[PDB]
Each structure stands twice: as C-alpha cells, then as structure tokens.
Amino acid sequence: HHWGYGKHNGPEHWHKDFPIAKGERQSPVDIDTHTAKYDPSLKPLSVSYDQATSLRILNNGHAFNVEFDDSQDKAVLKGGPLDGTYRLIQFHFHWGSLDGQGSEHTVDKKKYAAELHLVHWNTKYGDFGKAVQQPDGLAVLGIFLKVGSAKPGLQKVVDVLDSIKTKGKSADFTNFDPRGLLPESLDYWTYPGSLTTPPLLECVTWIVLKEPISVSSEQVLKFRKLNFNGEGEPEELMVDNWRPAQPLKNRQIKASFK
C-alpha cells in the first residue's frame, strides 16, 4: 500500500509487505544468453492483435498503462511456450533516469533504456483476478527499448503523456494499434516468473523478445517527464521504475532460436 521505487519504499523493502518477493520464481532475471538453451519443443509464437481495442491510458503512480477491452478475444497471444489463449489486458513500460538503465530484464547483464510489457491473461480462468491465483495465469511479452531512431508507432503514446502527468490521471486512448510497438523478429527467451511489482505474484510465463525496438531520445525524455506524485504534490519524476534482476533459483531460460 505504500511501495514504490525510492530508497525508503523501493524493491529492497517490498518483502516486508509482500514476502513472496524472496520467492522461488521472481522476476525479472538476467538472461545469460550462453546458458539459455534452444528448445525445439517451442511452437511458433502467435501475436494476434488485429482486432485490439484500446480504451484508455492511466498514470497509476508507478507507470502508465494503456488499457484494452478484454471482454472478448480481440487481441491474443498464443503459441510459443503457451497452452491455450491469453488475452491482452494492458501494456506499460519501465524506464530509467538515463539511457544506461531502465529495463527490468537484462541480457548478459546489459540494461536497456526501457522495457515494454504487454500483459495477457489465460482465458481458461475467466478473469484476470482468477488468473493471478494460477501458476499459468498470465503471459507477459517483454520488449526492450534502446535509444536511436524514433519508433513511429510509439509517438501517439508519447503525445498523450502531457495529459496524464500525475498519479490517478487518465485519458481516452482509443484506436491505438499495439502492432506498431513490435520489432521485426519474434525470436524470444522464455521462463516462468512473477509480476515485477507488488503483489509480485508467481503466475507469469515471461516471453522476452531478443530484438529491441529503437526509440528516440526525445521519446524517452517524454517518459521521464511523468510524475509519480499526484496533482499539486511536490514533483517526483517518474524515472527508474524498474525492479532489478532477481535470483534465477531452480529455473531454466529457454530460447526459441539458435
């Protein structure tokens, strides 16, 4: 109820209210590329976002979420390591104060400038709340961001952030196409993990794409102008809203590519 990313409420403190923080399948993790094993058992990943229906964008004090209508299979993730159908509910990002940090997952200890999370729930459990009681309840598609050329499909998101500067603000965000945030390649790593924020629930099949997307310096600078605080409160820029890598423990990361 008062967690955050500060010195006094950040990741090193979460375990006191959320003891699963020290659990057996916490996220994110470092992806050691040389230890990940190619798995021929993985089937192709299927990202089916053609009928995605975005609704709203919300600053929740921790990040911003672009929310989707998940009342029907309009945008789903299937295939790869997944059994069944996972419905897109929201996406959000984690990012840094500087371009050398911001991602949650790391690749051979490399931190990217940011990381996109497309969050999906397993339709066999009927709603998100029931899905987060299940060890295969969620699938999060993670995409790294590096700073270079602008990402045209991100600009509509960047352009609305001025209207949701502070915690609790929302704005209409209809007709946004999340396909414009994907890299060319769907080559991925996958492992079983958790939500990376409280409540840190161990329900997630992580699918982390190998290929980063490029965003421009100007695009990420606009992320960094958001606020963690509410309207009228002293300004605390929304930066460094990432959890560091957690112990891998008894897990293997699988690669979909050689």
Ligand X SMILES: NCCc1ccc(S(N)(=O)=O)cc1
Which parts are annotated binding residues for substrate? Answer: 196-197
Interaction of residue 117 with Zn ion, rule CB under 5 A: yes
Q: Which residues does the annotation place in the binding site for Zn(2+)?
A: 92, 94, 117
Segment 136-155, which members bind ligand X (CB under 6 A)?
140
Interaction of residue 196 with ligand X, rule CB under 6 A: yes
Q: Which residue's entry shows tokens 């976002």?
A: 49
Q: Which residue's entry shows tokens 């270079």?
A: 148
Catalytic residue status for 15: no
**How many of the other CB atoms lie within 10 Å of CB of 86?**
29
Query: Smallest distance, Å, CB 77 to ligand X?
Result: 13
Interaction of residue 190 with ligand X, rule CB under 6 A: no
**Which of 42/201 has CB closer to ligand X?**
201
Q: Which residues pair with 68 in a beta bridge?
A: 54
CA distances (Å), origin 178, targets 55, 63, 113: 12, 17, 20
Residue range at the interface with ligand X (CB under 6 A); choices 168-176, 177-185, 190-198, 209-217: 190-198
Closest CA to 246 of 212, 207, 188, 200: 200
Total number of residues that touch ligand X (CB under 6 A): 6
State how far the Cα of 57 lies from the Cα of 172, in Å rounded to an integer: 6
CB of 126 closer than 8 Å to CB of 109 = no
Among candidate residues 2, 8, 15, 62, the one labeled active-site is 62
Residue range at the interface with Zn ion (CB under 5 A); choices 35-43, 113-121, 234-242, 245-253: 113-121
Closest CA to 152 of 132, 177, 169, 118: 177
Interaction of residue 87 with Zn ion, rule CB under 5 A: no
Active site residues: 62
- Contact footprint for ligand X (CB under 6 A): 117, 119, 140, 195-197
